């Protein structure tokens, strides 16, 4: 189905392919961007510890602060995903 | 010019009108959503302490965790703004 493109990453190379997995499952399951975003957020809070934040959309700009090595931003198809750890 | 609509807020009623100000100035100054977002982020990091995160866009869903009383989400015209404190 969808094509994973990483645009900016500061994160273990494994957690990246992991972040794509959690998102690919989320895209397969949910439709609303808010919903997709909670799935990913919750899964990362579960696996790696709190506190993840996730933004899912086709149009937004961001400026966030993230703990070192805990930040990814990528596209799955035409939806884009921002997933960082701060808190 | 633009019409400020608050959609969800957990934040002092004053910091809200403040968040609209920081955004209205940001919209007047910058054009790219990423840029607008950094202006607001940086200003809040300045006034109220670290650590703010800001998302600016016309299309995105979010799921974040924020410190109590440090969260706003609102529209300025057709752009929407998410501004929370976690970290």
């Amino acid at each position: 189905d969808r094509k994973a493109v990483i645009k900016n990453a500061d994160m273990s190379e494994e957690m990246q392919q992991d972040a794509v997995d959690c998102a690919t499952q989320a895209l397969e399951k949910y439709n609303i961007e808010k919903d997709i975003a909670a799935y990913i957020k919750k899964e990362f809070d579960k696996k790696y510890n709190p506190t993840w934040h996730c933004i899912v959309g086709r149009n937004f700009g961001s400026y966030v602060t993230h703990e070192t090595r805990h930040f990814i931003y990528f596209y799955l198809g035409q939806v884009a995903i921002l997933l960082f750890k701060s808190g | 010019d633009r019409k400020a609509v608050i959609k969800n807020a957990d934040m002092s009623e004053e910091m809200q009108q403040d968040a609209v100000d920081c955004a209205t100035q940001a919209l007047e100054k910058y054009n790219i959503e990423k840029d607008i977002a950094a202006y607001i982020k940086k200003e809040f990091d300045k006034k109220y302490n670290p650590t703010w995160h800001c998302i600016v866009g016309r299309n995105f869903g979010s799921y974040v965790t924020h410190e109590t009383r440090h969260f706003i989400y609102f529209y300025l015209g057709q752009v929407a703004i998410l501004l929370f404190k976690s970290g």
Binding site: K7, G57, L82 | -
Partner: peptide, 9 residues
Amino acid sequence: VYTKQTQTT
């Protein structure tokens, strides 16, 4: 701890 700007294409 670092900081990142991101913008959709």
